[PDB]
């Protein structure tokens with residue numbers, strides 16, 4: 571299948587013409603951060619010494635990391651903090667590919683260890699009313715793909731028009747990634763993390779959970795032994 575790299579999405583001109591030759595996915599508005607449609611301290615880690623750096627600054631036992639909170643610039647490890655990954659776009663090396671049946675997908679360019687941050691899932695943040703409106707909007711238009719992720723009560727990310735390359739991650743009944751919900755400046759975000767070692771060339775997948783709506787659920791083509799046959803939480 572045609573591949574491309576995250577850098578390819580930076581040139582919209584080169585992208586729009588790549589898309590017409592189907593060597594790239596359909597155009598969408600690229601964003602490095604979530605957009606609210608309707609508008610809405612620190613850890614006690616011990617500052618590591620610099621030859622200790624040759625131990626993890628803000629590791630397993632960090633008060634913020636334990637609450638899935640990122641540190642700010644005011645972290646007692648300042649620059650050396652390993653818990654600012656979302657903020658520093660410390661994304662994994664991932665390519666975008668055409669799958670047999672699922673549309674476009676993500677694959678690992680290098681071997682990703684377990685428990686590795688992949689990408690933030692970015693989009694427009696909708697309330698429940700905005701969501702329900704859009705689902706019928708999209709259904710009405712006979713859209714083939716759906717890009718919704720539950721963030722919390724009355725907050726659902728919609729990657730349909732605006733997002734980044736996280737929106738290409740396909741669902742699998744038997745996945746190699748999970749979502750983790752992380753707090754950054756008192757604002758909740760969501761990102762993909764490997765749950766095991768993902769060999770280079772491998773498609774990244776996660777187990778999409780989401781309350782079902784309507785009658786015709788999308789069929790799963792994951793090919794897993796334990797395939798539930800349908801996408802959604804049901």
Ligand SMILES: CC(=O)N1CCN([C@H]2CCC[C@@H](NC(=O)c3cc4c(F)ccc(C)c4[nH]3)C2)CC1
Nearest residue numbers: 709716717718719739740741778783784786801
């Ligand atoms: C009448 C009708 O045609 N339908 C009934 C309503 N249904 C949508 C209900 C709400 C959730 C929609 N699914 C997603 O948004 C979604 C899937 C997915 C995935 F498989 C991997 C990764 C992500 C981020 C994903 N998001 C399906 C569309 C079909």
Ligand SMILES: C[S@@+](CC[C@H](N)C(=O)[O-])C[C@H]1O[C@@H](n2cnc3c(N)ncnc32)[C@H](O)[C@@H]1O
Nearest residue numbers: 672673674714715716737738740741790791792
């Ligand atoms: C967030 S998008 C994932 C990227 C999508 N392949 C694309 O080209 O934009 C989710 C959509 O991809 C498709 N998809 C994802 N996982 C799938 C699976 N296991 N089986 C079938 N279709 C899948 C469905 O159309 C679903 O609505």
Ligand SMILES: [Zn+2]
Nearest residue numbers: 613615628632
């Ligand atoms: Zn810390």
Ligand SMILES: [Zn+2]
Nearest residue numbers: 628641645651
């Ligand atoms: Zn820190």
Ligand SMILES: [Zn+2]
Nearest residue numbers: 743790792797
């Ligand atoms: Zn499946």
